[PDB]
Design a protein around this nucleic acid. Structure first.
Ligand SMILES: [Zn+2]
Lengths: 60, 59, 155, 206, 80, 24, 98, 127
RNA sequence: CCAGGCCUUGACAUGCUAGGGAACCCGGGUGAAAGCCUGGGGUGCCCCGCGAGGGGAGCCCUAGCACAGGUGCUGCAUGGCCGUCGUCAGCUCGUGCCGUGAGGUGUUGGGUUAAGUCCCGCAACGAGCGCAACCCCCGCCGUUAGUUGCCAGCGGUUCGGCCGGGCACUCUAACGGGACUGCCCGCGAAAGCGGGAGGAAGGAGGGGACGACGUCUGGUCAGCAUGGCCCUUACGGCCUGGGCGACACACGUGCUACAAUGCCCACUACAAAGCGAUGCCACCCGGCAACGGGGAGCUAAUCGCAAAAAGGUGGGCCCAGUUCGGAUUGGGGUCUGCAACCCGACCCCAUGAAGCCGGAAUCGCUAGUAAUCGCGGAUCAGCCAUGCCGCGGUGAAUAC
């Protein structure tokens, strides 16, 4: 995540097809979840601390 | 159109773009995929028998 | 199996006849767990026996099995850095198992088109002491006393 | 690696979420982003205050950020000058008009997050790694604690081969889902590298 | 068997740039990256230079090659 | 018949509908 | 006919909150249908553990959004007194449509 | 008058109703045989009745929801069993030896990750 | 990443010295875009002696500066997190005792266990990390709860649980019960083992989550962070087009099939778990059709995705490279989207390849497993997903 692409991808583009997602936190973009807005790494790192409400550990 | 006439329309249809510098055309000359497949693996239907070449050691 | 002998699965008898030997047989025909089909195969395959043979298919079935259970077999063994075929007396469990399995592996090799038929016919030629289900039997035993030169090891 | 962040494993029987509220689908992602923004100031400005936790109760338009400090006589400031600032510097970010409560930390020695930090600063002051650790552990043991434990990342005293310093007393059953072991993590930045401090503190039972 | 529904696409970059070449008659060389565009009968006979990955291959247009696109005339892959 | 995109199971597989698998 | 829906993340937080609405409702209201679960909707999260590349790792995370309901037929201005501003939970949302 | 029993199996429930009658089975208003047409082991349902020579003394108003037709069988079967105690509790005497008041967790096992099913691990070639 | 065109206190932070301007907004020229040039309207808050105007805060440009920026090397400089031996049953400590000492004992031996699990014994007695247990799902049942559920019991039907009416059942979900080798027989010094019974369930009832001390200098500086060296008119920044999809080949994971225990068409029946606002789309209509026009319902136990498929009945096929198989190619369409040539999926007509069950060799799986069948979701305009992560339907064999 280069500052050049984080702050970049935020600006409104000339084509809406162009607008991709990035993690609000890490800057990763390979695979962020819409529901939270974070990278699959960041999702974890937080879920653990408990900083994402109602987000428990699955078990069945 | 059936045999006597189809096998003709297609044959020439192929030459159509062949005669022109048409990408799709080139694929026809090379005997590769045309509709957009990969040429690293599974494409044995357009090339046919496998032409095994040599490689190099690593051990 | 390393700690125990491992209990053998008890099956549910048949809804029609009630012999569990039946259930075992079908299970062996069943592919992709289509047990509803496998059942029909056996059934209509019995109907063929009534129309072509003047006997009760239940008993016929049994005599067929009874007649394929090979009573002698071979078991590979590395005795002195070599593959010596060691004949041995076969147990009741294995007999039953081998029979059904061959009745079907041979069956499906028949030149016949319909599957219910193919089975029906194997159950007949069986009793009479022929076909190929019984051939895979005599072929085995023909290896038993064939190398009975070696029956002097384990058991 | 093995292990599983103790906390994340316990929010179920005992240990609540660091931000408990509710949300839809359209607001969740947004809400949370603003949340994380909050800590991105508290952590910065409330360093020396001995921060610990940041509870966050949301509601309609109203919001409440309870901040646990070791040394509140700092967050507060002179008669109520800094806490005044922290609210305005706060609304500058969130257009939500939110309160900020402050709860003194009953014994900073029993608060894993803090404990970890304690070591950290000590490592930046070029202190003695091995010793720094041992003392740390006893501090927790003397007061209360049914079990303590401190770890370190690597490059103890700036060596050329990062190692790990192990140390603990009492019990620390990271396997007993009815423990209630706090776990802190520091991150000292030294001239030769980054080193990671980890606390673990066993408290009570059922 | 490819398709663009109802409304053939051509980039206004050269469209209105090529039509200004008919008022005068003919031209010689054109250069525009847009290869996205389908070829119109109104372009026939012109000598357009389309961009490769690095080069700018000129492409002469004929009556029989109108049903295609510019890109179909720019080979990108260098082989053998 | 899972690759014959012009049969019953053919669409079922790709999950599309056409002249061989309609909407009723 | 006050329809009361209670959506929340903690079933304890709802249970109580749904009890709080149930208690002072029979005190000043009339015949209450009690609290009823739905369903409850979950949001699974299958993420990989290591930030590197080990597909076979993967940690599982869930997010249950429980749903509760409390109906109150024959609504009196008295009932709407006790249940006007007598709440306590923080991670619970309510919506009424009558 | 009315004999309910409750019969659950493999995520499927079956409402069991035994009224004294001629002996017929109505499932969801449909002729028993018309519903279970082609089902070989279908007959299994009635095994518990034919257990106490009680074939044809009761009727069968049975419903069912969930599961699979070839699991709806065992489903009813159990059900019929449970209602039968109501009529005569001393019935276990012949029932349990046949084990019809048993219920096994034969449920479909959770799909584990990394794998391709419950156990089915993916194959490796050169190790 | 490559090409070509363009940019430099720079797309982003904090700030400094000099000079000019509220911010802002709306055009045009050149252009592939970015960028460059150019033009207009436009003139706020502060503080001052009325005015004129003067200094100032924020904001903008310009010139210089501190610095921004770097997916640029180094995972043998590091954090964190993960893979791994290994869910294996071990790894250790205090004190006591043994030994000049390194160390030993305990932890071992005999029995037992899934287990350093427990019994007996013994210079040891304990303890820690690990096993187990506490926690979640599944199976029985109880209480609390009734807009799911039903003639279960009564009254009407457009006979659709549709309506009333009713919570009983199904359910839904929150709490609690229930198995402990407790009972009986035999074996045993004990631990425990075998067998039986009552029970929904047995000896850890099925599955989860859960990985010790350490090992590999494991992996990862391209997630993040970070010591260090390296670039700063560029190793940076914007853009357009190309590339990551290249092909004589080779190997891995898989998908489709070689067919009659089958293929096709038709009519007909059981599922679960998920997701849905500009989103799921009922329903009508146009079209072979993908789709489109129209338009209701749902904010979702009350609407929708939806059809489950295999199965079941009828009928067609007749053993053919075939009504098996669907590759490739021609043709014509739909949709997404700025744009589908490179390089999208989908429909339809035609084409109908290899392939008739696989060399040496090699994988998985011990029960609702495998095998087989369909369904859902994440990501996502769309989609190259036959992948992944879950769901249930049916349902084996076999272990000396
Ligand atoms: Zn992130």
């Amino acid at each position: 995540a280069r500052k050049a692409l984080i702050e970049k991808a935020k600006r409104t583009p000339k084509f809406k097809v162009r607008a991709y997602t990035r993690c609000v936190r890490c800057g990763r973009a390979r695979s962020v979840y819409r529901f939270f807005g974070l990278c699959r790494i960041c999702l974890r790192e937080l879920a653990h601390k408990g900083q994402l409400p109602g987000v428990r550990k699955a078990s069945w | 159109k059936l045999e006597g006439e189809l096998r003709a329309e297609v044959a020439a249809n192929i030459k159509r773009l062949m005669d022109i510098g048409c990408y799709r055309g080139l694929r026809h000359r090379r005997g590769l995929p045309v509709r957009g497949q990969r040429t690293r693996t599974n494409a044995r239907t357009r090339k046919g028998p496998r032409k095994t070449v040599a490689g190099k050691k690593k051990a | 199996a390393r700690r125990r002998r491992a209990e053998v699965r008890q099956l549910q008898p048949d809804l029609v006849y009630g012999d569990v030997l039946v259930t075992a047989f079908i299970n062996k025909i069943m592919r992709d767990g289509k047990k509803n089909l496998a059942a029909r195969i056996f059934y209509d395959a019995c109907k063929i026996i009534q129309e072509k043979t003047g006997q009760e298919p239940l008993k016929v079935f049994k005599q067929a099995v009874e007649n394929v259970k090979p009573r002698m077999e071979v078991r590979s063994r590395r005795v002195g850095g070599a593959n010596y075929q060691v004949p041995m007396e076969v147990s009741p469990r294995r007999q039953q198992s081998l029979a059904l399995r061959w009745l079907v592996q041979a069956a499906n090799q028949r030149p016949e088109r319909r599957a219910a038929v193919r089975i029906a016919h194997e159950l007949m030629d069986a009793a009479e002491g022929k076909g190929g289900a019984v051939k895979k039997k005599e072929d085995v035993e023909r290896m038993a006393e064939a190398n009975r030169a070696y029956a002097h090891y384990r058991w | 690696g093995n292990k599983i962040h103790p906390i994340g494993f316990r929010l179920g029987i005992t240990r609540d979420w660091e931000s408990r509220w509710y949300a839809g689908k359209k607001q969740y992602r947004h809400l949370l982003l603003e949340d994380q923004r909050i800590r991105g100031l508290l952590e910065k400005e409330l360093y020396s205050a001995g921060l610990a936790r940041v509870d966050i109760e949301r509601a309609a338009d109203n919001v409440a950020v309870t901040v646990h400090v070791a040394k509140p006589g700092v967050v507060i400031g002179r008669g109520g000058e800094r806490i005044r600032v922290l609210r305005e510097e706060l609304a500058k970010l969130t257009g939500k008009n939110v309160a900020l409560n402050v709860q003194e930390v009953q014994n900073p020695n029993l608060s894993a997050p803090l404990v970890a930090q304690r070591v950290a600063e000590q490592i930046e002051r070029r202190f003695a790694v091995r010793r720094a650790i041992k003392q740390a552990v006893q501090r927790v043991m003397e007061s209360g604690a049914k079990g303590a434990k401190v770890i370190v990342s690597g490059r103890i005293g700036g060596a050329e081969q990062a190692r790990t310093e192990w140390a603990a007393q009492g019990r620390v059953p990271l396997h007993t889902l009815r423990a209630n072991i706090d776990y802190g993590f520091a991150l000292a930045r030294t001239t030769y590298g980054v080193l990671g401090v980890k606390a673990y503190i066993f408290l009570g039972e059922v | 068997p490819r398709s663009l529904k109802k409304g053939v696409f051509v980039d206004d970059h050269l469209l209105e740039k090529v039509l200004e070449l008919n008022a005068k008659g003919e031209k010689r060389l054109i250069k525009t990256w847009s290869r996205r565009s389908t070829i119109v009968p109104e372009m026939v006979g012109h000598t357009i230079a389309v961009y490769n990955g690095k080069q700018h291959v000129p492409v002469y247009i004929t009556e029989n090659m109108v049903g295609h696109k510019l890109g179909e005339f720019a080979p990108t892959r260098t082989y053998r | 018949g899972k690759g014959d995109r012009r049969t019953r199971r053919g669409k079922i597989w790709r999950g599309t509908y056409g002249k061989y698998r309609p909407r009723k | 006919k006050i329809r009361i829906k209670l959506r929340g993340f903690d079933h304890k937080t709802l249970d109580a909150s749904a009890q709080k609405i149930v208690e002072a409702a029979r005190r000043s209201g009339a015949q209450v249908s009690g609290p009823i679960p739905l369903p409850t909707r979950v949001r699974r999260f299958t993420v990989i553990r290591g930030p590197f590349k080990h597909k076979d790792s993967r940690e599982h995370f869930e997010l249950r959004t429980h749903n509760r309901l409390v109906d109150i037929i024959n609504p009196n201005r008295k009932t709407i007194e006790q249940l006007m501003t007598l709440d306590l939970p923080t991670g619970v949302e309510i919506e009424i449509k009558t | 008058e009315q004999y309910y029993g409750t019969g659950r199996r493999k995520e499927a429930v079956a409402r069991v109703f035994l009224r004294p009658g001629n002996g017929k089975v109505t499932v969801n208003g449909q002729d028993f045989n018309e519903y279970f047409q082609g089902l070989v082991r279908a007959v299994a349902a009635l095994e518990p009745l034919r257990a106490v020579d009680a074939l044809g003394r009761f009727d069968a108003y049975i419903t069912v929801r969930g599961g699979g037709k070839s699991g709806q069988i065992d489903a009813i079967k159990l059900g019929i069993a449970r209602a039968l105690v109501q009529y005569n509790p001393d019935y276990r005497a012949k029932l349990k030896p046949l084990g019809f008041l048993t219920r096994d967790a034969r449920v479909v096992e959770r799909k584990k990750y990394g794998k391709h099913k419950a156990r089915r691990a993916p194959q490796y070639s050169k190790r």
